[PDB]
Short mmCIF file of N, CA, C and O in Angstrom, two decimals:
data_model
loop_
_atom_site.label_atom_id
_atom_site.label_comp_id
_atom_site.label_asym_id
_atom_site.label_seq_id
_atom_site.Cartn_x
_atom_site.Cartn_y
_atom_site.Cartn_z
N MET A 1 2.08 26.82 -64.76
CA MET A 1 3.09 27.35 -63.45
C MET A 1 2.96 29.25 -63.85
O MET A 1 2.00 29.55 -62.52
N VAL A 2 3.63 29.73 -64.27
CA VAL A 2 2.75 31.05 -64.76
C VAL A 2 1.13 31.33 -64.40
O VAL A 2 0.55 30.38 -65.33
N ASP A 3 0.75 32.21 -64.22
CA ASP A 3 -0.25 32.39 -64.17
C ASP A 3 -1.03 32.91 -65.59
O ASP A 3 -0.22 33.43 -66.38
N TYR A 4 -2.61 33.33 -65.49
CA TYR A 4 -2.71 33.35 -67.05
C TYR A 4 -3.05 34.91 -66.74
O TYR A 4 -4.93 35.40 -67.46
N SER A 5 -2.54 36.10 -66.48
CA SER A 5 -3.04 37.40 -66.27
C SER A 5 -3.44 37.90 -68.00
O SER A 5 -2.49 38.41 -68.63
N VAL A 6 -4.78 37.66 -67.91
CA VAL A 6 -5.31 38.24 -69.11
C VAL A 6 -6.60 37.95 -69.45
O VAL A 6 -7.85 38.78 -70.31
N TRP A 7 -7.39 37.34 -68.57
CA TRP A 7 -8.69 36.89 -68.93
C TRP A 7 -9.51 38.21 -67.61
O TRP A 7 -10.73 37.59 -67.74
N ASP A 8 -8.72 38.69 -67.28
CA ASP A 8 -9.16 39.77 -66.70
C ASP A 8 -8.17 40.62 -65.69
O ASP A 8 -8.73 42.01 -65.48
N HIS A 9 -6.50 39.93 -65.45
CA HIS A 9 -6.22 40.74 -65.13
C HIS A 9 -5.71 42.11 -66.51
O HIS A 9 -5.06 43.23 -65.70
N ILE A 10 -5.80 41.86 -67.19
CA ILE A 10 -5.82 43.10 -68.08
C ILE A 10 -6.44 44.67 -67.94
O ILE A 10 -6.42 45.58 -67.90
N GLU A 11 -7.77 44.21 -66.84
CA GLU A 11 -8.07 45.06 -66.00
C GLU A 11 -8.99 46.05 -67.74
O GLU A 11 -8.30 46.82 -67.92
N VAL A 12 -10.36 45.68 -67.42
CA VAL A 12 -11.12 46.85 -68.77
C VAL A 12 -12.13 47.17 -67.52
O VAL A 12 -13.01 48.22 -68.11
N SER A 13 -11.76 47.28 -66.69
CA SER A 13 -13.37 48.03 -65.79
C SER A 13 -14.70 46.96 -66.22
O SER A 13 -15.65 47.82 -66.28
N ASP A 14 -14.70 45.92 -66.55
CA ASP A 14 -15.92 45.08 -66.28
C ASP A 14 -16.44 45.36 -67.46
O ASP A 14 -17.87 45.39 -67.83
N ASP A 15 -15.55 46.13 -68.93
CA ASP A 15 -16.12 46.61 -70.15
C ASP A 15 -17.70 47.07 -69.81
O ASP A 15 -18.45 46.80 -69.83
N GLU A 16 -16.86 48.70 -70.15
CA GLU A 16 -17.84 49.62 -69.87
C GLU A 16 -19.10 49.35 -68.62
O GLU A 16 -18.30 49.06 -68.14
N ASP A 17 -19.66 50.23 -68.15
CA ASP A 17 -20.42 50.32 -67.17
C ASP A 17 -21.79 49.53 -67.58
O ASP A 17 -21.66 48.80 -68.56
N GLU A 18 -22.78 49.87 -66.25
CA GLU A 18 -24.06 48.17 -66.64
C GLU A 18 -25.02 49.12 -67.21
O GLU A 18 -26.04 48.87 -67.62
N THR A 19 -24.75 50.59 -67.77
CA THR A 19 -25.67 51.38 -68.83
C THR A 19 -24.93 51.73 -69.36
O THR A 19 -23.74 51.88 -69.66
N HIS A 20 -25.97 51.78 -71.03
CA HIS A 20 -25.17 52.54 -72.21
C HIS A 20 -26.35 52.33 -73.37
O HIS A 20 -26.48 52.07 -74.12
N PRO A 21 -27.76 53.40 -73.03
CA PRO A 21 -28.71 53.62 -73.96
C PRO A 21 -28.25 54.28 -75.13
O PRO A 21 -27.30 54.95 -75.17
N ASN A 22 -28.83 53.88 -76.33
CA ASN A 22 -28.17 54.34 -77.19
C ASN A 22 -29.56 53.57 -78.60
O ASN A 22 -29.44 52.76 -79.36
N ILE A 23 -30.54 54.49 -78.21
CA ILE A 23 -31.42 54.34 -79.19
C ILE A 23 -32.14 55.56 -80.10
O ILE A 23 -31.63 56.76 -80.29
N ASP A 24 -32.68 55.61 -80.81
CA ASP A 24 -33.59 56.18 -82.05
C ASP A 24 -35.24 56.37 -82.71
O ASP A 24 -35.82 57.31 -81.58
N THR A 25 -35.05 55.29 -83.52
CA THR A 25 -36.75 55.14 -83.77
C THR A 25 -37.18 53.82 -83.25
O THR A 25 -37.82 53.43 -82.84
N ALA A 26 -36.80 52.79 -84.23
CA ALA A 26 -36.86 51.65 -84.11
C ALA A 26 -36.04 50.40 -83.21
O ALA A 26 -36.73 49.64 -82.62
N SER A 27 -34.63 51.17 -82.67
CA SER A 27 -34.31 50.05 -81.76
C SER A 27 -34.57 50.75 -80.40
O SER A 27 -34.63 49.47 -79.82
N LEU A 28 -35.75 51.14 -80.53
CA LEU A 28 -36.42 51.15 -79.32
C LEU A 28 -37.46 50.23 -78.85
O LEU A 28 -36.34 49.19 -77.81
N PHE A 29 -37.82 50.02 -80.19
CA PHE A 29 -38.61 48.38 -80.06
C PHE A 29 -37.96 47.38 -80.28
O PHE A 29 -38.04 46.02 -79.39
N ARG A 30 -37.33 47.35 -80.73
CA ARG A 30 -35.90 46.27 -81.07
C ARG A 30 -35.09 45.67 -79.43
O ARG A 30 -35.33 44.69 -79.17
N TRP A 31 -34.64 47.18 -78.98
CA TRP A 31 -33.93 46.84 -77.42
C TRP A 31 -35.21 46.20 -76.67
O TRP A 31 -34.59 45.71 -75.51
N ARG A 32 -36.23 46.63 -76.71
CA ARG A 32 -37.58 46.57 -75.49
C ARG A 32 -37.49 45.15 -75.90
O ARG A 32 -37.26 44.67 -75.10
N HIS A 33 -38.26 44.27 -76.88
CA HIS A 33 -38.31 43.08 -77.08
C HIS A 33 -36.93 42.37 -76.56
O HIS A 33 -37.14 41.28 -76.12
N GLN A 34 -36.01 42.17 -77.14
CA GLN A 34 -35.07 41.87 -77.10
C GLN A 34 -34.26 41.67 -75.47
O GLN A 34 -34.14 40.92 -75.29
N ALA A 35 -34.41 42.59 -75.19
CA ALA A 35 -33.76 42.70 -73.26
C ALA A 35 -34.98 42.03 -72.78
O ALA A 35 -34.43 41.27 -72.23
N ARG A 36 -36.49 42.53 -72.81
CA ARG A 36 -37.22 41.51 -72.29
C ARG A 36 -36.68 40.26 -72.13
O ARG A 36 -36.82 38.87 -71.10
N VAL A 37 -36.60 39.42 -74.01
CA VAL A 37 -35.97 38.21 -73.74
C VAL A 37 -34.73 37.54 -73.58
O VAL A 37 -34.88 36.88 -72.88
N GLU A 38 -33.97 38.37 -73.46
CA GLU A 38 -32.56 38.21 -72.53
C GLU A 38 -32.93 37.91 -71.53
O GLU A 38 -32.38 36.88 -70.82
N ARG A 39 -33.42 38.90 -70.31
CA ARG A 39 -33.36 39.01 -69.40
C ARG A 39 -34.70 37.59 -68.44
O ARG A 39 -34.30 36.63 -67.77
N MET A 40 -35.38 37.26 -69.49
CA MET A 40 -36.13 36.41 -69.44
C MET A 40 -35.63 34.65 -69.34
O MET A 40 -35.60 34.29 -68.27
N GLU A 41 -34.93 34.48 -70.38
CA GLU A 41 -34.18 33.49 -70.52
C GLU A 41 -33.16 33.16 -69.37
O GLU A 41 -32.71 32.03 -68.99
N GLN A 42 -32.46 34.52 -69.54
CA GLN A 42 -31.51 34.39 -68.58
C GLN A 42 -31.96 34.27 -66.52
O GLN A 42 -31.61 33.44 -66.09
N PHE A 43 -32.91 35.28 -66.70
CA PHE A 43 -33.41 34.74 -65.15
C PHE A 43 -33.76 33.73 -64.78
O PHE A 43 -33.69 33.09 -63.92
N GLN A 44 -34.87 32.99 -66.34
CA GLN A 44 -35.38 31.89 -66.21
C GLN A 44 -34.38 30.79 -65.78
O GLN A 44 -34.69 29.53 -64.84
N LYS A 45 -33.45 31.18 -66.43
CA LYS A 45 -31.88 29.91 -66.53
C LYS A 45 -31.82 29.43 -65.22
O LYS A 45 -31.69 28.59 -64.12
N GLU A 46 -31.14 30.67 -64.80
CA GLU A 46 -30.15 31.21 -63.45
C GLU A 46 -31.03 30.93 -62.28
O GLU A 46 -30.18 30.12 -61.14
N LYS A 47 -32.72 31.17 -62.17
CA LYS A 47 -33.27 30.62 -61.35
C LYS A 47 -33.86 29.04 -61.37
O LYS A 47 -33.78 28.85 -59.92
N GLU A 48 -33.95 28.70 -62.38
CA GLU A 48 -34.32 27.40 -62.47
C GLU A 48 -32.96 26.45 -61.35
O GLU A 48 -33.32 25.51 -60.66
N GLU A 49 -31.47 26.68 -61.96
CA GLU A 49 -30.73 26.19 -61.56
C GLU A 49 -30.24 26.44 -60.35
O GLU A 49 -29.74 25.43 -59.46
N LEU A 50 -30.93 27.54 -59.81
CA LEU A 50 -30.55 28.08 -58.18
C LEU A 50 -31.12 27.52 -57.54
O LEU A 50 -30.89 26.93 -56.33
N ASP A 51 -32.69 27.59 -57.60
CA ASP A 51 -33.44 26.19 -56.95
C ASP A 51 -33.29 25.27 -56.98
O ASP A 51 -33.52 24.22 -55.89
N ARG A 52 -32.96 24.51 -57.73
CA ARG A 52 -32.64 23.23 -58.09
C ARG A 52 -31.20 23.12 -57.51
O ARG A 52 -31.32 21.63 -56.68
N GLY A 53 -30.24 23.80 -57.91
CA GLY A 53 -28.96 23.22 -56.64
C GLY A 53 -29.05 23.09 -55.50
O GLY A 53 -28.41 22.72 -54.40
N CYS A 54 -29.99 24.34 -54.63
CA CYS A 54 -30.62 24.59 -53.59
C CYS A 54 -31.04 23.76 -52.54
O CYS A 54 -30.86 22.91 -51.50
N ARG A 55 -31.83 23.17 -53.60
CA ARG A 55 -32.40 22.11 -53.08
C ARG A 55 -32.04 20.49 -52.95
O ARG A 55 -31.69 19.90 -52.08
N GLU A 56 -31.37 20.40 -54.25
CA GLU A 56 -30.57 19.29 -53.85
C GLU A 56 -29.53 19.01 -53.18
O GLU A 56 -29.45 18.33 -52.47
N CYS A 57 -28.54 20.61 -53.27
CA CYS A 57 -27.88 20.40 -52.44
C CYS A 57 -28.03 20.08 -50.39
O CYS A 57 -27.81 19.26 -49.73
N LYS A 58 -29.20 20.73 -50.43
CA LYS A 58 -29.62 20.67 -49.12
C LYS A 58 -30.30 19.76 -48.89
O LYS A 58 -29.63 19.59 -47.52
N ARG A 59 -30.73 18.73 -49.81
CA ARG A 59 -31.05 17.27 -49.18
C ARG A 59 -29.75 16.41 -48.83
O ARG A 59 -29.83 16.10 -48.20
N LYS A 60 -29.20 16.45 -50.06
CA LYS A 60 -27.81 16.06 -49.90
C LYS A 60 -27.01 16.12 -48.67
O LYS A 60 -27.00 15.07 -47.68
N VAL A 61 -26.87 17.26 -48.44
CA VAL A 61 -26.26 17.59 -47.39
C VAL A 61 -26.81 17.32 -46.21
O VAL A 61 -26.08 16.90 -45.01
N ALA A 62 -27.98 17.60 -46.14
CA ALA A 62 -29.02 17.02 -45.19
C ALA A 62 -28.57 15.86 -44.49
O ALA A 62 -28.32 15.36 -43.58
N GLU A 63 -28.94 14.73 -45.51
CA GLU A 63 -28.84 13.30 -45.55
C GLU A 63 -27.28 13.00 -44.97
O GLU A 63 -27.17 12.12 -43.99
N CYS A 64 -26.49 13.38 -45.54
CA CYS A 64 -25.17 13.13 -45.01
C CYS A 64 -24.44 13.02 -44.49
O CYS A 64 -23.78 12.86 -43.26
N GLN A 65 -24.76 14.86 -43.86
CA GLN A 65 -24.68 15.24 -42.22
C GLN A 65 -25.15 14.13 -41.23
O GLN A 65 -24.55 13.87 -40.92
N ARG A 66 -26.67 14.29 -41.36
CA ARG A 66 -27.17 13.30 -40.28
C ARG A 66 -26.85 11.91 -40.44
O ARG A 66 -26.36 11.41 -39.49
N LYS A 67 -26.19 11.65 -41.54
CA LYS A 67 -24.98 9.80 -41.71
C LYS A 67 -23.98 10.50 -40.63
O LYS A 67 -23.83 9.26 -39.71
N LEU A 68 -23.28 10.85 -41.56
CA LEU A 68 -21.45 11.45 -40.81
C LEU A 68 -22.17 11.68 -39.52
O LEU A 68 -21.14 11.17 -38.33
N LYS A 69 -23.02 12.29 -38.79
CA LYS A 69 -23.21 12.98 -37.53
C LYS A 69 -23.61 11.82 -36.58
O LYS A 69 -22.84 11.55 -35.38
N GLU A 70 -24.51 11.10 -37.23
CA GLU A 70 -25.32 9.66 -36.22
C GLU A 70 -23.72 8.87 -36.11
O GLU A 70 -23.93 7.80 -35.15
N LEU A 71 -22.88 8.59 -37.06
CA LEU A 71 -21.89 7.61 -37.21
C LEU A 71 -20.48 8.02 -36.41
O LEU A 71 -19.57 7.16 -35.97
N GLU A 72 -20.57 9.42 -36.54
CA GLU A 72 -19.42 10.59 -35.72
C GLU A 72 -19.06 10.22 -34.60
O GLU A 72 -18.25 10.00 -33.98
N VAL A 73 -20.87 9.55 -33.68
CA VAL A 73 -20.32 8.93 -32.06
C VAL A 73 -20.14 7.78 -32.32
O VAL A 73 -19.75 7.28 -31.30
N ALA A 74 -19.90 6.95 -33.04
CA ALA A 74 -19.90 5.62 -33.09
C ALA A 74 -18.44 5.39 -33.00
O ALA A 74 -17.54 6.37 -33.69
N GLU A 75 -17.74 4.50 -32.18
CA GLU A 75 -16.93 3.79 -32.27
C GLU A 75 -15.61 3.87 -33.31
O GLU A 75 -16.19 3.97 -34.04
N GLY A 76 -14.61 3.92 -33.20
CA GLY A 76 -13.37 4.22 -34.79
C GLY A 76 -13.20 5.04 -34.57
O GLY A 76 -12.69 6.50 -34.95
N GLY A 77 -11.65 4.70 -34.24
CA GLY A 77 -10.15 5.21 -34.07
C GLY A 77 -10.09 6.36 -35.40
O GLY A 77 -10.47 7.51 -35.55
N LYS A 78 -8.85 5.61 -36.68
CA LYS A 78 -8.99 6.13 -37.71
C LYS A 78 -10.21 6.67 -38.63
O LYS A 78 -10.35 7.32 -39.13
N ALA A 79 -11.67 6.05 -38.12
CA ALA A 79 -12.13 6.06 -38.63
C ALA A 79 -13.08 7.77 -38.64
O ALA A 79 -13.64 8.36 -39.59
N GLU A 80 -12.62 8.36 -37.64
CA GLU A 80 -12.74 9.64 -37.63
C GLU A 80 -12.32 10.64 -38.94
O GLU A 80 -12.76 11.38 -39.20
N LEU A 81 -10.97 10.33 -39.37
CA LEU A 81 -10.43 10.82 -40.38
C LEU A 81 -11.56 10.83 -41.33
O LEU A 81 -11.66 11.02 -42.51
N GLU A 82 -11.81 9.40 -41.59
CA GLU A 82 -12.76 8.69 -42.92
C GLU A 82 -14.13 9.95 -43.12
O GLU A 82 -14.57 10.35 -43.81
N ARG A 83 -14.98 9.71 -41.95
CA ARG A 83 -15.92 10.70 -41.60
C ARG A 83 -15.48 12.16 -41.59
O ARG A 83 -16.43 12.88 -42.48
N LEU A 84 -14.89 12.46 -41.16
CA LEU A 84 -14.29 14.29 -41.08
C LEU A 84 -13.88 14.34 -42.50
O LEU A 84 -14.32 15.65 -43.04
N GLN A 85 -13.15 13.32 -43.73
CA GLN A 85 -12.71 14.04 -44.48
C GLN A 85 -13.75 13.80 -45.63
O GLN A 85 -13.86 14.76 -45.87
N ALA A 86 -14.38 12.76 -45.55
CA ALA A 86 -15.94 12.71 -45.96
C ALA A 86 -16.67 14.10 -46.50
O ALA A 86 -17.31 14.96 -47.00
N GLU A 87 -17.04 14.48 -44.75
CA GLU A 87 -17.47 15.27 -44.50
C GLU A 87 -17.32 16.89 -44.77
O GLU A 87 -17.69 17.30 -45.55
N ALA A 88 -16.03 17.00 -44.28
CA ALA A 88 -15.48 18.01 -44.82
C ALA A 88 -15.23 18.68 -46.33
O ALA A 88 -15.60 19.71 -47.35
N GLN A 89 -14.85 17.33 -46.86
CA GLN A 89 -15.29 17.48 -48.47
C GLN A 89 -16.23 17.74 -49.18
O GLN A 89 -16.19 18.22 -49.86
N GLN A 90 -17.12 17.07 -48.28
CA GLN A 90 -19.03 16.74 -49.08
C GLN A 90 -19.23 18.53 -49.15
O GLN A 90 -19.69 19.32 -50.21
N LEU A 91 -18.88 19.49 -48.03
CA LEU A 91 -19.41 20.60 -47.95
C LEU A 91 -18.48 21.49 -48.72
O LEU A 91 -18.75 22.33 -49.33
N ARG A 92 -17.38 21.41 -48.55
CA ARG A 92 -16.15 22.44 -49.14
C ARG A 92 -16.30 22.09 -50.75
O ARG A 92 -16.02 22.59 -51.13
N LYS A 93 -16.38 20.86 -51.07
CA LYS A 93 -16.86 20.92 -52.50
C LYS A 93 -18.39 21.36 -52.97
O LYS A 93 -18.31 21.91 -53.96
N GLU A 94 -19.21 21.24 -52.14
CA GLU A 94 -20.73 21.46 -52.45
C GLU A 94 -20.74 23.36 -52.32
O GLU A 94 -21.38 23.96 -53.24
N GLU A 95 -19.94 23.85 -51.60
CA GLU A 95 -19.96 25.30 -51.80
C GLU A 95 -18.66 26.06 -52.81
O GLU A 95 -18.98 26.76 -53.47
N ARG A 96 -17.75 25.12 -52.90
CA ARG A 96 -17.06 25.60 -53.66
C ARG A 96 -17.46 25.47 -55.06
O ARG A 96 -17.14 26.57 -56.16
N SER A 97 -18.05 24.23 -55.32
CA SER A 97 -18.66 23.73 -56.97
C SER A 97 -19.83 25.19 -56.84
O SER A 97 -19.70 25.65 -58.20
N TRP A 98 -20.88 25.37 -56.01
CA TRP A 98 -21.76 26.26 -56.69
C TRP A 98 -21.23 27.52 -56.77
O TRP A 98 -21.78 28.35 -57.35
N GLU A 99 -20.05 28.16 -55.64
CA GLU A 99 -19.58 29.32 -55.91
C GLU A 99 -19.15 29.21 -57.27
O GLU A 99 -19.55 30.44 -57.69
N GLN A 100 -18.39 28.71 -57.54
CA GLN A 100 -17.37 28.73 -58.84
C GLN A 100 -18.85 28.54 -60.35
O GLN A 100 -18.85 29.51 -60.97
N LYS A 101 -19.35 27.34 -60.06
CA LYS A 101 -20.85 27.45 -60.97
C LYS A 101 -21.69 28.52 -61.51
O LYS A 101 -22.15 28.90 -62.45
N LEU A 102 -21.38 28.97 -59.86
CA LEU A 102 -22.38 30.48 -59.71
C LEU A 102 -21.90 31.87 -60.50
O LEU A 102 -22.01 31.99 -61.62
N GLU A 103 -20.49 31.59 -60.25
CA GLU A 103 -19.70 32.63 -60.77
C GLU A 103 -19.65 32.58 -62.54
O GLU A 103 -19.84 33.67 -63.18
N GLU A 104 -19.98 31.61 -62.92
CA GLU A 104 -19.67 31.19 -64.13
C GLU A 104 -20.93 31.30 -64.82
O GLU A 104 -20.81 31.68 -66.25
N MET A 105 -21.87 30.44 -64.31
CA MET A 105 -23.57 30.38 -64.80
C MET A 105 -23.92 32.08 -65.09
O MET A 105 -24.62 32.30 -65.75
N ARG A 106 -23.69 33.10 -64.46
CA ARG A 106 -24.03 34.58 -64.28
C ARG A 106 -23.14 34.43 -65.32
O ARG A 106 -23.39 36.01 -65.74
N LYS A 107 -21.59 35.04 -65.29
CA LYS A 107 -20.61 35.09 -66.32
C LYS A 107 -21.00 35.06 -67.51
O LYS A 107 -21.12 35.94 -68.41
N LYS A 108 -21.81 33.79 -67.93
CA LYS A 108 -21.99 33.00 -68.82
C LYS A 108 -23.41 33.73 -69.77
O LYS A 108 -23.60 34.18 -70.56
N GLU A 109 -24.55 33.38 -68.51
CA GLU A 109 -25.66 33.77 -68.73
C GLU A 109 -25.98 35.61 -69.34
O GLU A 109 -26.84 35.58 -70.18
N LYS A 110 -25.03 36.29 -68.45
CA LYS A 110 -25.07 38.02 -68.54
C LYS A 110 -24.58 38.28 -70.21
O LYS A 110 -25.02 39.24 -70.64
N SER A 111 -23.65 37.34 -70.26
CA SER A 111 -23.32 37.45 -71.40
C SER A 111 -23.30 36.67 -72.96
O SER A 111 -23.25 36.18 -73.96
N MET A 112 -24.64 35.45 -72.60
CA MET A 112 -25.20 34.72 -73.42
C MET A 112 -25.47 35.02 -75.05
O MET A 112 -25.55 36.29 -75.37
N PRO A 113 -25.60 34.09 -75.92
CA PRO A 113 -25.59 34.74 -77.17
C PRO A 113 -26.84 34.91 -77.85
O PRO A 113 -26.89 35.58 -78.66
N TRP A 114 -27.75 34.90 -76.86
CA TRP A 114 -29.44 35.34 -76.85
C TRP A 114 -28.99 36.52 -77.02
O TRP A 114 -30.32 37.55 -77.50
N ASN A 115 -28.50 37.08 -75.94
CA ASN A 115 -28.25 38.83 -75.68
C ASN A 115 -28.40 39.75 -76.66
O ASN A 115 -29.02 40.97 -76.96
N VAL A 116 -27.39 39.12 -77.74
CA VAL A 116 -26.80 40.02 -79.11
C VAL A 116 -27.83 39.46 -80.24
O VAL A 116 -28.14 40.22 -80.82
N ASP A 117 -28.41 37.78 -79.85
CA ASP A 117 -29.34 37.63 -81.33
C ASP A 117 -28.49 37.90 -82.46
O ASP A 117 -26.95 37.57 -82.52
N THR A 118 -28.97 37.05 -83.41
CA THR A 118 -28.21 37.13 -85.08
C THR A 118 -27.11 35.87 -84.87
O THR A 118 -26.24 36.65 -85.16
N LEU A 119 -27.81 34.75 -84.61
CA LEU A 119 -26.81 33.49 -84.75
C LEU A 119 -27.54 32.19 -84.45
O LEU A 119 -28.93 32.18 -84.46
N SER A 120 -27.07 31.25 -84.51
CA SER A 120 -27.20 29.77 -84.90
C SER A 120 -27.63 29.81 -82.96
O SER A 120 -27.54 30.35 -81.99
N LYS A 121 -28.73 28.52 -83.06
CA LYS A 121 -28.72 28.21 -81.78
C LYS A 121 -28.02 27.32 -81.10
O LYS A 121 -26.90 26.62 -81.78
N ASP A 122 -28.23 27.20 -79.85
CA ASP A 122 -27.02 26.60 -78.89
C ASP A 122 -27.82 25.07 -78.24
O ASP A 122 -26.96 24.70 -77.25
N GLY A 123 -29.05 24.90 -78.57
CA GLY A 123 -29.35 23.86 -78.17
C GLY A 123 -30.05 23.97 -77.01
O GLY A 123 -30.21 23.38 -75.65
N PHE A 124 -30.58 25.14 -76.74
CA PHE A 124 -31.29 25.41 -75.24
C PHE A 124 -32.32 24.45 -75.14
O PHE A 124 -33.30 24.43 -75.74
N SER A 125 -32.32 24.44 -73.92
CA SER A 125 -33.17 23.32 -73.43
C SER A 125 -33.78 24.23 -72.01
O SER A 125 -33.46 24.92 -71.18
N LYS A 126 -35.26 24.38 -71.91
CA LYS A 126 -35.91 24.70 -70.77
C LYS A 126 -36.85 23.45 -70.40
O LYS A 126 -36.01 23.42 -68.62
#
Protein backbone atom coordinates (compact mmCIF):
# COMPACT_ATOMS: atom_id res chain seq x y z
CA MET A 1 0.00 0.00 0.00
CA VAL A 2 2.50 2.61 1.20
CA ASP A 3 4.68 4.07 -1.55
CA TYR A 4 8.43 3.47 -1.79
CA SER A 5 9.68 7.05 -1.53
CA VAL A 6 13.42 6.41 -1.27
CA TRP A 7 14.63 5.02 -4.59
CA ASP A 8 14.39 8.57 -5.93
CA HIS A 9 11.86 10.49 -3.84
CA ILE A 10 14.83 11.28 -1.61
CA GLU A 11 15.78 13.85 -4.25
CA VAL A 12 19.53 13.72 -4.89
CA SER A 13 19.62 15.82 -8.06
CA ASP A 14 20.37 12.69 -10.10
CA ASP A 15 23.57 12.31 -8.07
CA GLU A 16 25.83 15.19 -9.08
CA ASP A 17 25.86 16.54 -12.64
CA GLU A 18 26.85 14.94 -15.94
CA THR A 19 30.32 16.44 -15.56
CA HIS A 20 33.05 16.09 -12.93
CA PRO A 21 36.65 16.07 -14.23
CA ASN A 22 39.33 15.06 -11.73
CA ILE A 23 42.63 14.11 -13.36
CA ASP A 24 46.30 14.80 -12.62
CA THR A 25 48.96 12.68 -14.32
CA ALA A 26 48.09 9.04 -14.97
CA SER A 27 44.40 9.59 -14.22
CA LEU A 28 44.17 11.12 -17.69
CA PHE A 29 45.18 7.97 -19.57
CA ARG A 30 43.35 5.71 -17.12
CA TRP A 31 40.12 7.70 -17.36
CA ARG A 32 40.54 7.89 -21.13
CA HIS A 33 40.75 4.14 -21.73
CA GLN A 34 38.16 3.35 -19.06
CA ALA A 35 35.80 5.97 -20.49
CA ARG A 36 36.06 4.70 -24.06
CA VAL A 37 35.51 1.11 -22.93
CA GLU A 38 32.60 2.19 -20.74
CA ARG A 39 30.66 4.01 -23.46
CA MET A 40 31.80 1.30 -25.87
CA GLU A 41 30.16 -1.65 -24.11
CA GLN A 42 27.30 0.57 -22.94
CA PHE A 43 26.46 2.12 -26.32
CA GLN A 44 27.04 -1.23 -28.02
CA LYS A 45 24.67 -3.06 -25.67
CA GLU A 46 21.90 -0.45 -25.67
CA LYS A 47 22.32 -0.26 -29.44
CA GLU A 48 21.90 -3.97 -30.16
CA GLU A 49 18.93 -4.02 -27.79
CA LEU A 50 17.37 -1.01 -29.52
CA ASP A 51 17.64 -2.32 -33.08
CA ARG A 52 16.67 -5.77 -31.81
CA GLY A 53 13.58 -4.63 -29.94
CA CYS A 54 12.70 -2.22 -32.75
CA ARG A 55 12.79 -4.78 -35.55
CA GLU A 56 11.21 -7.50 -33.40
CA CYS A 57 8.44 -5.23 -32.13
CA LYS A 58 7.67 -3.77 -35.56
CA ARG A 59 7.58 -7.27 -37.05
CA LYS A 60 5.23 -8.76 -34.45
CA VAL A 61 3.07 -5.64 -34.19
CA ALA A 62 2.91 -5.52 -37.99
CA GLU A 63 1.71 -9.10 -38.42
CA CYS A 64 -0.53 -9.06 -35.34
CA GLN A 65 -2.05 -5.75 -36.44
CA ARG A 66 -2.75 -6.99 -39.96
CA LYS A 67 -4.35 -10.08 -38.43
CA LEU A 68 -6.68 -8.42 -35.92
CA LYS A 69 -7.33 -5.81 -38.61
CA GLU A 70 -8.34 -8.29 -41.31
CA LEU A 71 -10.44 -10.18 -38.76
CA GLU A 72 -11.92 -7.03 -37.21
CA VAL A 73 -14.02 -6.89 -40.38
CA ALA A 74 -15.32 -10.44 -39.94
CA GLU A 75 -18.64 -10.84 -38.14
CA GLY A 76 -18.63 -11.54 -34.41
CA GLY A 77 -20.44 -9.61 -31.71
CA LYS A 78 -18.46 -10.37 -28.56
CA ALA A 79 -15.56 -11.10 -30.91
CA GLU A 80 -15.09 -7.33 -31.07
CA LEU A 81 -13.91 -7.31 -27.45
CA GLU A 82 -11.56 -10.22 -28.10
CA ARG A 83 -9.81 -8.49 -31.01
CA LEU A 84 -9.86 -5.10 -29.29
CA GLN A 85 -8.53 -6.63 -26.07
CA ALA A 86 -5.70 -8.59 -27.68
CA GLU A 87 -4.80 -5.61 -29.87
CA ALA A 88 -4.99 -2.83 -27.29
CA GLN A 89 -3.09 -5.12 -24.92
CA GLN A 90 -0.52 -5.98 -27.59
CA LEU A 91 0.48 -2.37 -28.24
CA ARG A 92 -0.03 -1.18 -24.66
CA LYS A 93 2.25 -4.01 -23.52
CA GLU A 94 4.78 -3.42 -26.30
CA GLU A 95 5.10 0.30 -25.55
CA ARG A 96 4.89 -0.17 -21.78
CA SER A 97 7.48 -2.95 -21.82
CA TRP A 98 9.86 -1.11 -24.15
CA GLU A 99 9.50 2.13 -22.18
CA GLN A 100 10.16 0.48 -18.82
CA LYS A 101 12.86 -1.89 -20.07
CA LEU A 102 14.43 1.14 -21.74
CA GLU A 103 14.56 3.40 -18.69
CA GLU A 104 16.00 0.49 -16.70
CA MET A 105 18.37 -0.56 -19.49
CA ARG A 106 19.86 2.93 -19.64
CA LYS A 107 19.61 3.49 -15.88
CA LYS A 108 21.62 0.31 -15.28
CA GLU A 109 23.95 0.49 -18.28
CA LYS A 110 24.81 4.07 -17.33
CA SER A 111 25.86 2.82 -13.89
CA MET A 112 27.21 -0.53 -15.07
CA PRO A 113 29.91 -2.20 -12.92
CA TRP A 114 32.34 -1.97 -15.84
CA ASN A 115 32.18 1.83 -15.73
CA VAL A 116 34.05 1.87 -12.42
CA ASP A 117 35.90 -1.39 -13.07
CA THR A 118 37.85 -3.20 -10.35
CA LEU A 119 35.56 -6.17 -9.72
CA SER A 120 34.46 -9.63 -10.87
CA LYS A 121 32.73 -10.45 -14.16
CA ASP A 122 28.97 -10.54 -14.70
CA GLY A 123 28.89 -12.98 -17.61
CA PHE A 124 28.59 -10.22 -20.21
CA SER A 125 27.56 -11.54 -23.62
CA LYS A 126 28.26 -9.92 -27.00
